[PDB]
Amino acid sequence: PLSETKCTLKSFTVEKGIYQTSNFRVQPTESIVRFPNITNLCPFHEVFNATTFASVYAWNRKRISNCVADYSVIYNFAPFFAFKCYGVSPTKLNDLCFTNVYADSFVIRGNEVSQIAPGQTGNIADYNYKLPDDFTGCVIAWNSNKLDSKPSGNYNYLYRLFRKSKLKPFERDISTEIYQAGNKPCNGVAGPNCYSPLQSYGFRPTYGVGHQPYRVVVLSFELLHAPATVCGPKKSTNLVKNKCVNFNFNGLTGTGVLTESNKKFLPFQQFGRDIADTTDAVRDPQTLEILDITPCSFGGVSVITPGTNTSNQVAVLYQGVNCTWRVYSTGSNVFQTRAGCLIGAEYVNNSYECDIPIGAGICASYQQSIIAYTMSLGAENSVAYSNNSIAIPTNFTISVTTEILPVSMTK
Amino acid sequence: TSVDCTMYICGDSTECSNLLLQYGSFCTQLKRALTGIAVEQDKNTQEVFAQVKQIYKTPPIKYFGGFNFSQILPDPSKPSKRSPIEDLLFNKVTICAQKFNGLTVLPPLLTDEMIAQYTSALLAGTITSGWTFGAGPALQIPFPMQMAYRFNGIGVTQNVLYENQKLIANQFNSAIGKIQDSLSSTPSALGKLQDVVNHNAQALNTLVKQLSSKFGAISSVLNDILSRLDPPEAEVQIDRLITGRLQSLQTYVTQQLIRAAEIRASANLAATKMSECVLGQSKRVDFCGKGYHLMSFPQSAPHGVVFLHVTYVPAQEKNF
Amino acid sequence: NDILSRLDPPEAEVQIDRLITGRLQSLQTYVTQQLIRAAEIRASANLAATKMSECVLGQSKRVDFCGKGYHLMSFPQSAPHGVVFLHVTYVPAQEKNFTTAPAICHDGKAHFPREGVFVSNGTHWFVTQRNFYEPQIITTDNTFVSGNCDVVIGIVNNTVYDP
Amino acid sequence: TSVDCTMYICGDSTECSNLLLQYGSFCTQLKRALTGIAVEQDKNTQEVF
């Protein structure tokens, strides 16, 4: 630590006094992941591979209940074209559990695939469809020219481009949708301005690249919610006691040591957020056991030394850390001042005048050895007191003393 | 107090420290500022208290002309070596989760025991030796011998004391008896030290609650962002949270350097009054209390000092 | 210089925008620290000017304000960005413990010191001042009379001399 | 002097105040400090007058 002091103070000589360095910061031993034992096969093939799906005007917005799925079911389709995703990068949609996945499937053209991106306007992003622009979910598209396309032409599929008023994100609009525009009442039967909001597509397999049928599934969800709905398989492991450890409890993680229950809770109340708005108490995903999280203790390392011109025997102190404990290896002597742990120095019952302060009336000095001692207030003195005695001085001295006062610093 | 710049800004994440080091040259100044305010603050107490390098003790027998001082001298039968006035000042004046975010507090170099010993030695010097002990060796003087000279310092002939010392003793004993119930009657008189304590406390609390802030980020948590996004993107979310936290540090330590300034001035003024109202009989009017000043008693307090000024006011007058 | 040689100026303000801000906050921190240190050294200069006015231009009889103990006189001296004071003060060295009394009985009346402390070697009685031991003979012009020998405690029967 | 938190930073628009609340706990200590400076500044006349 003398060399660390030289490193910190960017000089080769240090004269005296207390200094600062980094902390202990003990490392976690292992990591604990806990999952509930309810692990089934979650059906995703019914939205991926099936018969000819509906057009974009009809949404099969599917609520996927509590299940267990991974990306292996999704991975079955090589012709994935629009692999672009938002919110979570596509390499890590595994081993994290959502709360409400929103799956909606439709069939669109090749050039309409790029229109599903948020914050833009297009054939789909017009009155036909409005979507939330934050879009924590993703879009997955794959070509289906060998199944959806028909030799006779797929003219049955429609889309409601020409609806009058605006759409809001995540709304359902399927009705007759009569068109009443112009400076005349159309009544749906006039003839001048009886425009049709629904138009056909046309699918024959001799086209360009931008007119091919594409299956698109869109997912919309959010995070930071206590229940978990669906995520990949992970072998749960047992917890540990009184050990610095990482933990992952179905989503949110942390690092610290664990303690048994001391409080009552409430039988749907499982989180333990404190006045500091930090998680410190939680219950097991598999059992009804309250456990308390307290993070592993920090250090705070300081160094004490005499003059480099004098000697090189140094000592270090750890603020707040009890030793009596988790300080790796020891040295010649360990002391347990209320300021903190101290090693590299000895202790005496004597009292001498302090040269460098440490804390709580403790000071370390140099004898060939570094000695830590309690505060010496000065020479102990008492004066006799009597009802009829006066001390009167006869000889005296004059003394000169110095005082140094700053006046101004450099302009 | 002391802060760790790495632990407050970032958790156990290497990449956050990597984006901290490209700033690099900020929290070293934070370190030097907190060490500077620490060495400035703990050095205040010696010139307030250790003005004498000769610790004294009280005589066992008190023939103090009928005076009583049992309320201010420390009681040996008390488990602590403090006066009952010190006990009232202690119990009339009133964390781990705050510590556990890299927010450390440092214990003072001086604890209560030896500053109580300093106050007891100061009382021993000012009772049995008068005020000459602030110059050289302590010269023992009887107390009614000293009060006559203190009257002579305020233009009073010493015959007045030797005529009315019984009434002086009764008045002073009654006043000391009154001052205990005066201090214990209301806690509004102790508001001059609760303000510093709770001002430090709420400043630390508004510092530590600043972590849960949506500083242009998807989430205020650092770990879930790492599990959320790729390392090229979301650096634009990390760095804004870095800036919003370091500006909070800047506003905190600027306010701390502001608040240390008047604390140093008040400590200097208290040391000046330690010099004047205790070690001498200053004729500066209203500087040592109200009216013509006789003498003062110092008593320690949590992070503070309190002075009992005994002064002099006339009661009955006539026209001539 | 290199970043203007590196980037098309439409994306310069995309790139060279924030280091200007960072230098601005760094210099703001420097300015704030300069104000703090300037206020501290301004208070120090006020204290130095006050002690220059007190300790030098007069015999300031405040204790510890102009040195240690009873202050006599002072020497000001310059220093690079500073001032240094040489205080010449008084301090007693040797002392003796003597027997006292607040008043003197003589002919049934009480004698009080006009100025000084009553002391005795054991056989005779004398008076001094509060800092030196010079025994003076108790004479009616060295003291004064107010009252008699009942209200005052510690009084001793003795003699006084009339010139 | 005193300064209002919301109306100075943002005009008569709701969404600027919505975008204001992300920092949230920043102008509270500013208002507390201005009331402080006001209260000891009004206090300063008592011990001198």
Author numbering:
A (entry chain F): 295 to 618, 633 to 675, 690 to 733
B (entry chain G): 734 to 827, 850 to 1075
C (entry chain F): 978 to 1140
D (entry chain C): 734 to 782
From the article:
As we expected, all three spike trimers mainly showed two ‘RBD-open’ and one ‘RBD-closed’ conformations with one or two ACE2 bound. To validate the hypothesis, we constructed recombinant RBD subunits of XBB.1.5, XBB.1.5+L455F, XBB.1.5+F456L, and XBB.1.5+L455F+F456L (“FLip”), and determined their binding affinities to hACE2 by surface plasmon resonance (SPR) assays.
Since late 2022, XBB* variants, especially XBB.1.5 and other XBB derivatives with a proline on residue 486 (486P) on the receptor-binding domain (RBD) of the virus Spike glycoprotein (S) started to dominate, which demonstrated enhanced binding to human ACE2 while maintaining extremely strong capability of evading humoral immunity. Interestingly, L455 and F456 are two adjacent residues on the receptor-binding motif (RBM) of SARS-CoV-2 RBD, and the variant is just the “flipping” of the two residues, L455-F456 to F455-L456, also known as the “FLip” mutant. L455F caused strong affinity reduction on XBB.1.5, but significantly improved the hACE2-binding affinity of XBB.1.5+F456L.
